[PDB]
Every structure is written in structure tokens, then in C-alpha cells.
Amino acid sequence: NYIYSTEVGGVGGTPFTFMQESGTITSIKFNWSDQYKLLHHIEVKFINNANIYATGDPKGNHEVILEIDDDETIIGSVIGYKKGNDGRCTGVKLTTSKGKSIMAGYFEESLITTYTGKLAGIKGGAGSDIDRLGLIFLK
Amino acid sequence: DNYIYSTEVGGVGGTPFTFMQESGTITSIKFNWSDQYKLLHHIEVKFINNANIYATGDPKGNHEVILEIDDDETIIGSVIGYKKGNDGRCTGVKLTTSKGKSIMAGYFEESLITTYTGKLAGIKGGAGSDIDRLGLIFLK
Amino acid sequence: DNYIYSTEVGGVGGTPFTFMQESGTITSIKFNWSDQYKLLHHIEVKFINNANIYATGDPKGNHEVILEIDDDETIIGSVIGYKKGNDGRCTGVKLTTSKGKSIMAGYFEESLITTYTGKLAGIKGGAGSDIDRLGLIFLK
Amino acid sequence: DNYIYSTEVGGVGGTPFTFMQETITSIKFNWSDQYKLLHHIEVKFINNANIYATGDPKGNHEVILEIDDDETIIGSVIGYKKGNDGRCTGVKLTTSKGKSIMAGYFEESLITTYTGKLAGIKGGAGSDIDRLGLIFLK
Amino acid sequence: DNYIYSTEVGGVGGTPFTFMQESGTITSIKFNWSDQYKLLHHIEVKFINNANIYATGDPKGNHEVILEIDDDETIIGSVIGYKKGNDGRCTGVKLTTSKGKSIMAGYFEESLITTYTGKLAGIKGGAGSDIDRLGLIFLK
Amino acid sequence: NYIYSTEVGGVGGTPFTFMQETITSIKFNWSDQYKLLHHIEVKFINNANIYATGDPKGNHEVILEIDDDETIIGSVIGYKKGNDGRCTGVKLTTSKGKSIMAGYFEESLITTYTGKLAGIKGGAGSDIDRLGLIFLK
Amino acid sequence: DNYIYSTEVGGVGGTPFTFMQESGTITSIKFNWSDQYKLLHHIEVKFINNANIYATGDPKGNHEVILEIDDDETIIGSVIGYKKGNDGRCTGVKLTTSKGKSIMAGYFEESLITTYTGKLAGIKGGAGSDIDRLGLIFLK
């Protein structure tokens, strides 16, 4: 029932997959640094679940939170990354069906304009940084 | 509940406040802030069918803005500026409404949350000298 | 009542005025202001089915603007600029209507209120040399 | 009447004029860079080749708005100097068909007038347009 | 008539021209103008079902623009720039059509007419070295 | 069955007329050196032949591919007027929001008739002396 | 065919590639390009319900962009930048989709093709160190 957007960035870090049976993302938080121009940390909350799912190390000087209403879809999604095996995820731009938008981090190297729809989860790898990030949507 | 609780952003300091009235949504909200500290210091809220003014924080800032909200008017666009971490603070609030009204209070040089939207019912957080922490509350 | 009273913004000074007519709406409002003081000094209001001009304050400013409002025309956008606190003043008014008409009077350098909207019915506040305090009144 | 009388803005000077016929198809404003005032106005009506003129046409600029039979004014601003020694300084009009004109200057006082089908004008004029008020249908 | 005559703007000079054909509308109009004099100098017009070119004035300008008009295409936006009085001249033409086509010829430094709109049927005025005077003609 | 848009430019060059029983591809070649169109190529639906005029000596080219149902809703040709005239540029916008811009628009313009582009006509040697578009009615 | 073959733009060099699936559309396309040469160097394509990557050229550029295409999503706007002639190269690609998604890869300093539009089904051309030549393939 799920669309797996390409995981962009490097092969490093510990695999993470954040999804909950018959749940969608209601909040996503990106942390990033001016020093490294990378995402370092991501937090996700799901509908009807007070648990915070976190990956990476929150060492950056900036954070943005996007709250998503239960009926609100992603109509516009770009992930900035550095390509290749030693790659990293550098930024995320999201626009929603209600005209909400966020811009986290940087877009100086490589971009993916992802699939769109109701954001259900995320997947990738993280240690100090977000090595690799892929979105997951409903069909 | 019949309520959506937006994330409380800012620090853990100050005295907890919750402004909500069983029957009545927010009809007026006033933000006070300073050029000196680039923080919100004080918030006042009035509800429908209630002449009481609910205030938190210290009104020491040189600026204030008031948004009046019609009975059928929703928030379609909401951003809160804050400084993150335990010693955090709330720095600004940008609201746009279903009737094209908008206000901008304080500053957005730090962290941002693009909150849930809908009929604004209350606010929650902590305040002393400053607004330590602010969270919006909407109807479902 | 059958009336929505927008917050009276400005100071506590000046002589009270309340301009309202039981079965009546505002058909004309005139604001007078000065570049010298960056304040509103004088306001005139006319009502439907009434040739009388209701005036408050001292018309000593170098500028005036008049908005004429058709019988079916509402205010969809209203901002008042003021200086807050007891020695406060009203500094400016921006109005936009359901027919795309707008006026801008005076200055917006300190505090703002984005007021309730709807059919403009009257005004209330205090005036002497200046408009100390101004509140709009709408129909329900 | 079946007429809406917009406030006459400007001074009390000049010779009274009232231009109406039992609507306006053409209006011409004349103004000067020298005085930053309207000096002269000409109006033509539907089914009437007569030109109704007031004031002295001594300005270096003129603008003409031609109005189709079904065309209304949706946006109207008059610039004026207030008080008894007042004058009319400028006119901005926008129409239901996206046509607009800008005549003269808007350095002092403004009126955002009533809107609708422009039927006549009224005021006072000598060397200048002392005072101008628009007249619409109900 | 079957025709609306827009005011002829410009001077009284030049040789009169009137370009109109009984069941014709204009299918092509060409304006020629100079950067040196900031005037229109020359106009050419073709009508539907008529290969003849009707020309007035002296084509001495460094610029020309041609608007081709489809059989069902109207003028929705028309401005002529001119110098007023007896020694007057036509300086520019801006035309926009029902199909989003537009042309801009010459200059708009003194006086303007926002003309009647509709199906462009002919033109009238006077021309010598320059376009002294130009008036548009539409169908009723 | 055709609308012949005014041929703009000079009287020079070898006459060309490209029409067959609509245009599916048109290519404009132009130079920064001369600020002129030099060469045009046209292909028609159900016809693999390329119809070419002029000398392709310019440093730029643009191709517009036109779908079978796609019309021209917006057309400007830039040219130098008079007998020694030339065609300098072409702007086209289509019913499907496609557009192209070739060459330069520093002197004279024609905003042409619109519709289904069927052929072209004019004269060409080293340059496109004159160009006129041809539409269906 | 059931296929529209857009003109292959660029040069005659490189190793031929043709990437199409009889019952397939493109679900992902990746362009790689360099600031150093201002050329496309490498292209990757994935087809619907197939994780396998079809690649041509040498991925030596410092930039890449990926466009993901939903099963019902068409290309409504396509431009390729190239250098013309036998020694030609592909320099850039702009694509816009039926859902308002767009990508911009590489450079547009010489020649452009505004291609056919529709459901993107495959690609064809030649590649070595660079993308010599690129042609898009759509459904009817």
C-alpha cells in the first residue's frame, strides 16, 4: 500500500525505518548545521502515538518542524544530497495541499524531486549525520 | 479530545499556563515583544462570550499586535519562531486567517514550526519575564 | 447587542465619543492626520438616511482621506496603528472593502490591530487635539 | 433621485457647474505641472454631440476616458487640497472593462468615492477645478 | 450609424485620411515611428476580403509594428499617446486584443486617451511627415 | 483553406514556399554575430523529408516539435524593414504552453495571425530575407 | 508504433543506447552533469514496477538531479539544451510534469529543443564520457 521514494545520500550510518501500521506522519523535525551544510537529526511523530522516533545526532544550530493535518498531503518534495558512497543528505523542501512549506538545510549539490502524496514514513541511514533519506507515501 | 495540540516550542522555564474555555474559541490574541531581546514577553487572550482577559508573561516589550478573529474565521497559516533547547524561548508568531487577515509579532532568526491549522481554541506553554514556550490548540 | 465592539486602541486621554445609529450603518468616514505629529487628529462619520456629520477631535492635520461605503459594502480588511499605554494615541487606519476600495490614513510605526471585519456600523473612543483612542463597531 | 451624489471635494470657490442629461460616454481632464491642479474638465453624454466644459484649459496635460454604454466605474479616487481655499488636484478611474486613467496629482487629500455607472459631475471651476463630485446611477 | 467614432487626438495639421470599407473590419494595422522625433510617422491598414493596402504619412521612422487581427478578434484595451492643441501630433499606440495579442508603438510622454473598445473597423485623422491626429472606429 | 500571414523582411534571396497535403517540427538557426535568422528547417506530418532554406552558419538553433492537435496561440517575428530587410527573430507560444525564442527583436515586430501552423513562405540566401507563416482557417 | 520519437539532439559520437519497455513507462530519471564542462555526462532510468537501473555515459559530473514520476504523471514541458553539429553534445534538461514537479539539469548556453509532451516511456541516443545525443520517447 506504500510508494518508496529513492533513498538519496551515502551508504554509511545505521539503517532506520519509521512507519506505523495504518498511521501517517503528523510531525517531522529536521536539525542541520551551517558548519557542515548537512542534516544531522530527524524526529518523526505518527497519528495516535505520543512516541518520538529519532535518528542521527542533534548537533546543528537550526531546526524546523512541519505539523501535518490528518487530511494534508505533500504536493511538492525536494531532497538535497551529496551523491556517492560517502554521501550525505543536505536538505529537505516540502510543500503541502494546504500551502504550508518548510525548507531545511542546503541544496548545493544533488536534488531529487520525489513522488508526492500522504507522507507515511521515512527510511535511510544516520550516525553523526543523515547519511541517506527516502520518503514513504500511501497509494 | 475534540482538540488538536500543536507542539509547544521553546524552553522548559516559566510558570505553566493553559488558556481554553469550554464554550468559546479565541476572539482576540495580543503579542508583546522587544527589539532589545528579540523575544515575545507577554500574551493576552479573550474568548467568545467572556469579557475576561487571560494574560501571561511580563508586558515589558516596545511592540504589541492584536489579531481579532471573527466567529467563523480559521487560521490557515501559522509559524512560531523559537530558540530550541531547555533554556529556550518563543521569539515570534506569524498567523494568516481564512479571511486574509495576517499578523507578524517578534522575530524569526532562529527555529520555526509550521503548525497545524484550523479554528484557534486556545494556547498553552510557560511564561515569566518572557514567553518560554508556546503551543497552539485547534478544534478537530 | 446586534454589535461587535473592536478593541479601542490608544490612550485613556480625550473626551469620550460614541457615534452609532440604531438602524444605520456608516456611509462615509473621514480621517485627518499630520506629518508633523504622525497621529490622527480628527474623524468625521456620516450614516445612511442622515445628512448629519458626526465629528470628534481637532482638524489641524495637513492630510485627510474619505472612504464612501455603498449600502451593501463591508470592511474585509481593517488595521489601526496606535501607540500603546495610558498616554497612547491612534496613529493610522488602513481599510479595504468587499468592492476592492481601500484607504490609508496616517502612520503605522508602533502597534497594530487587525480588527474584526463586517459591515461598519459606528466608532467609539476619545479625542481632544488628537485621536487618543479608536474602536470600530460592526453588525453581527 | 435615481442618483448617488459623491462628496464634492476641494474649495468653495469658482462658478457652480452641474453636468447631467435625462450617462457619460467621454470625460477629459486637463492639468498642469506648474500648479499640480486640475484646470479644466469636458464631458460628453450618450446620444448627444454637445461638449460640456468647465474651467480654463491652460494645463500642459490632458487624458480622455471613453466609456462603453455598459461600462461602470469600479475604482475612483480624487486628489484634492482641503479647506475653503481648496482645489481638485487629480482623478484616478478604473472601469468594469479594465480601462484606467490617472490625471494630475495626489500629494495632499484623497477620496475613494462611491462606484457604479458614471452619470454626471458637479462642483465649481474658474481658472482651476475648485471642487469636484461624481454622480452615479442607483 | 453602425460605427462608434473614438475621439481624434492630436493636431489639426496634415492631409485628412479616412480608412473604412462597407462590410470590412481591419485585418492588419502597421504603425511606423522614430526614436528621433518620438512620434508616429506612418500607418498602413488592410481590410478583410481586400488585398489593397491603405497608407497615410511618411514611413521615415526606424521602427514599425504590425498587428494581424483574426476575423473574430476584438480590441479590449486601447491607449493613444499624443501632444494636444492645434500643433499636436500622435506619439504612440498600445493595443491589446481578445486573444491576448498586444502591440506597443512609439511614446507616451504627454496626453493619453483610453478609447472605446470592440471590433476595430477603421481609422481617421490627418498625416503629413507625421501622424498629426488619429481616431479609431469600432462596430456597434 | 489557408491564412497567409504578412511576409516581413526584405525582397532579397531565393523564394521558398513549404506546404504539403501541417508542420510537426520547425528549426530556426541564428547568429550572435549578425543578430539575424540564417536558416529554417520544417518537417510535415506523415513525411520524413526535411524542407530547408538559407545557410545554417549561425552559432544557435531552436527546434519546436508540434503535437498533431497543437496550435500557435502567440506568434511574433522580429525583422528589419525595407527592401534590404531581413528576418531577425521568432517567438512562438502554443495551445499546450510550449514556447520557443530564436534570435533578436531590436527593430520591427509583427504579432501574426494564430491557429494551426501549416507552412511558411519567404526568401532566403545567406540569411532569412523574409518570412511569412501560413495557418489553417 | 504506439510511440512518439522526439528528435535526438547533439552529436553522432558515443555508444548507442535505447532504454524502453514494451509494457513500461519511466518512473525515475537521473541526470549527471559537470560545472567543469557544462555538459550532461550520465543518465540513469528506472521503469515502473522494476528496481533495475538502466545507465549510459560516465558519472564524472559533480551534480545529479532525479525526477520521480507517479504512474499517472505526464511531462507537459520538456526542453533539452545541446551543442549542434556532428561534434555535438547534450548540455541540459528542464522537465515539468502534470503535477507541477520540475527539474533543471546542466546548462542551456547554445541550442534548445522544446520537445513533444506526454507520458515519458523511454530515451535513446549516444554516450561515452558525455551524453553525445539524447532523444525522448513518449506514448500516443
Side-chain angles (χ1 to χ4, degrees), chain A residues 1-20 22-92 94-139, chain B residues 2-93 95-140, chain C residues 2-37 39-93 95-140, chain D residues 2-21 23-138, chain E residues 2-21 23-139, chain F residues 3 5-18 22-137, chain G residues 1-22 24-86 88-93 95-140:
Chain A
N1 325 279
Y2 298 120
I3 308 286
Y4 294 82
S5 162
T6 313
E7 291 177 38
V8 297
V11 302
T14 300
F16 68 84
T17 298
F18 300 153
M19 269 197 292
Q20 300 290 328
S22 260
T24 61
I25 294 191
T26 196
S27 159
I28 191 167
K29 173 197 292 179
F30 300 98
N31 174 278
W32 82 93
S33 65
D34 293 313
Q35 179 173 4
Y36 298 106
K37 296 159 143 203
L38 305 184
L39 303 189
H40 297 292
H41 175 95
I42 299 176
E43 283 181 14
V44 157
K45 298 201 319 154
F46 297 82
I47 283 172
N48 311 314
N49 179 352
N51 285 226
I52 295 166
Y53 300 79
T55 187
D57 176 12
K59 66 196 193 174
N61 52 322
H62 301 258
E63 81 172 31
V64 293
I65 298 173
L66 169 66
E67 289 197 319
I68 302 178
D69 302 320
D70 291 21
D71 62 350
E72 188 170 14
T73 58
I74 308 307
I75 64 161
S77 170
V78 170
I79 302 176
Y81 63 106
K82 290 170 177 169
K83 68 190 164 60
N85 291 340
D86 84 332
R88 293 295 189 286
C89 172
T90 64
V92 178
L94 300 171
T95 301
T96 73
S97 50
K98 302 206 159 150
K100 279 143 70 174
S101 75
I102 60 143
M103 182 153 312
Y106 287 82
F107 305 88
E108 285 183 325
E109 200 214 84
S110 293
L111 302 167
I112 173 166
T113 305
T114 73
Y115 299 116
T116 65
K118 184 66 200 182
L119 180 62
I122 64 166
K123 183 181 200 310
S128 291
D129 309 333
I130 310 305
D131 295 77
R132 155 175 87 266
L133 177 61
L135 305 183
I136 309 161
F137 301 96
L138 296 191
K139 276 189 97 138
Chain B
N2 321 281
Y3 298 119
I4 306 287
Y5 296 85
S6 163
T7 315
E8 291 175 50
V9 299
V12 302
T15 298
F17 68 84
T18 297
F19 299 156
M20 266 181 92
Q21 295 291 321
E22 162 75 6
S23 263
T25 51
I26 294 192
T27 197
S28 158
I29 191 168
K30 172 199 289 184
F31 302 95
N32 173 279
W33 81 93
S34 66
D35 294 316
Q36 178 173 5
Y37 297 109
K38 296 152 151 197
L39 301 188
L40 302 193
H41 297 292
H42 175 95
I43 300 176
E44 279 183 17
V45 161
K46 296 185 338 188
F47 296 81
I48 286 160
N49 311 312
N50 183 348
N52 286 204
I53 295 184
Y54 299 83
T56 189
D58 176 9
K60 67 187 188 179
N62 53 322
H63 297 281
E64 81 173 29
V65 294
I66 300 171
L67 170 65
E68 285 177 343
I69 305 181
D70 301 323
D71 294 10
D72 61 349
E73 188 169 12
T74 59
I75 307 307
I76 64 161
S78 168
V79 170
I80 304 181
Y82 64 105
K83 296 179 151 77
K84 71 173 167 40
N86 289 340
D87 198 27
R89 293 295 190 287
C90 169
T91 64
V93 179
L95 298 177
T96 301
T97 72
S98 51
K99 302 209 156 146
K101 279 142 70 175
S102 75
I103 59 142
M104 186 165 304
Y107 288 81
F108 307 86
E109 311 181 344
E110 318 274 359
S111 303
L112 298 167
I113 173 171
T114 305
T115 72
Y116 297 117
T117 66
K119 183 67 198 180
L120 177 64
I123 65 165
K124 181 179 203 310
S129 290
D130 310 332
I131 309 306
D132 295 77
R133 154 175 88 267
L134 178 61
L136 306 183
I137 308 159
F138 300 98
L139 295 190
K140 268 168 160 156
Chain C
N2 325 279
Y3 296 123
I4 306 286
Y5 293 82
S6 161
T7 312
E8 295 174 44
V9 298
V12 302
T15 298
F17 66 102
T18 304
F19 301 150
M20 278 166 93
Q21 297 289 314
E22 165 75 10
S23 278
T25 61
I26 292 189
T27 196
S28 158
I29 191 166
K30 171 155 21 126
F31 301 94
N32 173 280
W33 83 93
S34 66
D35 294 316
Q36 177 173 5
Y37 298 108
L39 302 187
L40 302 192
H41 297 292
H42 174 95
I43 301 176
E44 284 183 8
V45 151
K46 305 188 34 183
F47 297 84
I48 65 172
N49 310 314
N50 178 354
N52 288 134
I53 295 183
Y54 302 73
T56 187
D58 177 9
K60 67 185 195 179
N62 53 321
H63 296 282
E64 79 178 36
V65 294
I66 302 170
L67 169 64
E68 297 181 321
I69 304 170
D70 302 322
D71 292 16
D72 61 349
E73 187 171 11
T74 58
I75 307 307
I76 63 162
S78 169
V79 173
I80 300 169
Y82 63 105
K83 291 178 179 147
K84 70 191 167 54
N86 289 339
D87 199 25
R89 293 295 189 287
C90 174
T91 64
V93 179
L95 298 173
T96 304
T97 72
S98 50
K99 301 204 159 150
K101 279 143 70 174
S102 75
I103 57 145
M104 189 149 240
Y107 289 81
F108 306 86
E109 288 177 343
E110 197 213 273
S111 294
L112 296 174
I113 177 165
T114 304
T115 72
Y116 298 113
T117 67
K119 186 67 199 175
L120 179 60
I123 64 165
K124 181 181 200 312
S129 290
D130 312 332
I131 309 305
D132 295 78
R133 156 175 87 267
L134 176 60
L136 303 183
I137 307 160
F138 300 94
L139 295 187
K140 272 165 159 148
Chain D
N2 320 282
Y3 297 122
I4 308 284
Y5 295 83
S6 161
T7 312
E8 290 175 44
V9 298
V12 299
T15 302
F17 67 87
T18 298
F19 301 152
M20 271 201 284
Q21 301 289 324
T23 60
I24 295 190
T25 196
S26 159
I27 190 168
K28 173 197 293 177
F29 299 96
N30 173 278
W31 82 93
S32 66
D33 294 316
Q34 178 174 5
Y35 297 108
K36 296 159 172 211
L37 302 186
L38 301 193
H39 297 291
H40 175 95
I41 301 175
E42 283 180 13
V43 154
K44 299 192 33 193
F45 297 82
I46 284 170
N47 312 312
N48 179 352
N50 285 227
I51 295 181
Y52 300 79
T54 185
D56 178 15
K58 67 183 186 184
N60 52 322
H61 298 280
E62 80 177 28
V63 292
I64 299 172
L65 170 65
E66 288 180 330
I67 306 179
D68 302 321
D69 295 4
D70 61 351
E71 187 170 14
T72 58
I73 307 308
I74 63 162
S76 169
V77 171
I78 303 172
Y80 64 105
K81 290 172 158 159
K82 70 190 165 47
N84 289 339
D85 193 27
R87 295 294 190 289
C88 174
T89 64
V91 178
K92 270 180 219 193
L93 302 170
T94 300
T95 73
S96 50
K97 301 206 152 147
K99 281 145 67 174
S100 75
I101 59 143
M102 187 178 297
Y105 288 81
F106 307 85
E107 285 186 319
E108 199 212 272
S109 295
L110 297 173
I111 175 167
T112 300
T113 73
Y114 301 111
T115 66
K117 186 64 198 177
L118 179 61
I121 64 166
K122 182 177 198 312
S127 290
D128 313 330
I129 309 306
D130 295 76
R131 155 176 88 267
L132 176 59
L134 307 181
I135 308 161
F136 302 97
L137 293 192
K138 269 165 141 151
Chain E
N2 321 281
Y3 296 121
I4 309 282
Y5 297 82
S6 163
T7 303
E8 289 179 42
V9 297
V12 302
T15 298
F17 67 87
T18 300
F19 299 154
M20 270 205 280
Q21 299 290 326
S23 274
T25 58
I26 293 189
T27 197
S28 159
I29 189 168
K30 173 197 291 179
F31 301 85
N32 173 281
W33 83 92
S34 66
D35 294 316
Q36 196 61 228
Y37 299 107
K38 295 163 164 211
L39 301 192
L40 302 193
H41 298 291
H42 174 95
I43 298 178
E44 285 184 7
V45 157
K46 299 192 37 184
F47 297 82
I48 283 171
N49 312 313
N50 177 356
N52 286 209
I53 296 178
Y54 299 81
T56 185
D58 177 9
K60 67 187 191 179
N62 53 321
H63 296 286
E64 78 184 18
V65 294
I66 301 178
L67 170 65
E68 287 185 334
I69 304 177
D70 301 322
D71 299 359
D72 59 354
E73 186 171 10
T74 57
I75 307 307
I76 63 160
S78 167
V79 172
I80 301 165
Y82 63 104
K83 292 160 166 162
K84 70 192 175 75
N86 282 357
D87 195 24
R89 295 294 191 289
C90 171
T91 64
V93 179
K94 222 172 266 163
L95 299 177
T96 303
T97 73
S98 50
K99 302 207 154 148
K101 279 143 71 175
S102 75
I103 59 146
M104 189 189 288
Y107 289 82
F108 307 85
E109 289 181 337
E110 197 212 272
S111 294
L112 299 166
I113 176 166
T114 302
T115 72
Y116 298 113
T117 65
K119 185 67 196 177
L120 178 62
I123 63 167
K124 189 178 189 62
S129 294
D130 310 333
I131 308 306
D132 295 77
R133 156 174 89 266
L134 177 58
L136 305 185
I137 308 162
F138 300 95
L139 298 184
Chain F
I3 309 283
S5 159
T6 315
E7 288 178 46
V8 298
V11 301
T14 300
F16 68 85
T17 302
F18 301 153
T22 61
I23 295 191
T24 197
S25 154
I26 191 167
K27 172 196 292 179
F28 300 96
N29 174 279
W30 83 92
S31 65
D32 294 317
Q33 177 173 4
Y34 299 107
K35 296 180 173 197
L36 301 192
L37 302 193
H38 298 291
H39 174 95
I40 301 175
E41 281 180 15
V42 154
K43 301 187 330 171
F44 298 95
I45 288 174
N46 311 311
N47 179 351
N49 285 222
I50 294 176
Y51 299 78
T53 187
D55 176 11
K57 67 184 184 178
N59 52 323
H60 297 281
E61 80 177 26
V62 293
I63 300 171
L64 171 64
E65 288 176 332
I66 303 174
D67 302 320
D68 291 28
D69 62 348
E70 186 171 12
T71 57
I72 308 307
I73 64 160
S75 168
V76 172
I77 303 173
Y79 64 104
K80 290 177 150 148
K81 69 189 165 50
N83 292 336
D84 194 26
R86 295 294 190 288
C87 282
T88 64
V90 177
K91 262 173 193 142
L92 302 171
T93 302
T94 73
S95 50
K96 302 214 160 140
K98 279 142 71 174
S99 74
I100 59 146
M101 189 186 289
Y104 289 82
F105 306 86
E106 290 186 327
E107 198 213 273
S108 296
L109 299 173
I110 176 171
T111 200
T112 71
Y113 299 115
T114 68
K116 183 67 199 179
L117 180 61
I120 63 167
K121 182 178 198 311
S126 294
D127 311 332
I128 309 306
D129 295 77
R130 138 201 23 125
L131 177 58
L133 307 183
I134 308 162
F135 302 96
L136 290 200
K137 275 209 271 222
Chain G
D1 310 279
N2 319 282
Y3 299 124
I4 311 283
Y5 296 81
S6 165
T7 312
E8 288 176 45
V9 297
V12 300
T15 298
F17 66 89
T18 303
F19 299 152
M20 267 218 289
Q21 297 287 357
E22 199 246 15
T25 62
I26 294 190
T27 195
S28 154
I29 191 168
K30 172 197 294 178
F31 299 97
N32 171 282
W33 81 93
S34 66
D35 294 317
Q36 177 173 6
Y37 299 108
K38 297 171 164 199
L39 305 186
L40 301 192
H41 298 291
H42 174 95
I43 297 177
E44 283 181 15
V45 151
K46 305 191 326 176
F47 297 99
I48 205 163
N49 312 313
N50 172 1
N52 297 288
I53 292 164
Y54 301 69
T56 185
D58 178 8
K60 67 186 196 180
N62 51 324
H63 297 287
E64 81 183 20
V65 295
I66 300 174
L67 169 64
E68 290 180 334
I69 303 174
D70 301 320
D71 301 14
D72 61 349
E73 189 169 13
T74 58
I75 307 308
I76 63 161
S78 168
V79 172
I80 301 165
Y82 64 104
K83 290 162 162 166
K84 70 191 166 63
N86 289 341
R89 293 297 190 285
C90 283
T91 64
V93 177
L95 297 172
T96 301
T97 73
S98 50
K99 302 208 162 147
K101 280 144 68 173
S102 75
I103 58 145
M104 184 169 290
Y107 288 82
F108 306 86
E109 293 190 335
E110 198 212 273
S111 293
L112 299 169
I113 177 170
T114 307
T115 71
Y116 297 115
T117 66
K119 186 68 193 173
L120 180 61
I123 63 169
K124 182 178 197 313
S129 295
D130 310 334
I131 309 305
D132 297 77
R133 156 176 87 268
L134 177 58
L136 307 181
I137 307 161
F138 300 97
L139 294 189
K140 273 165 155 157

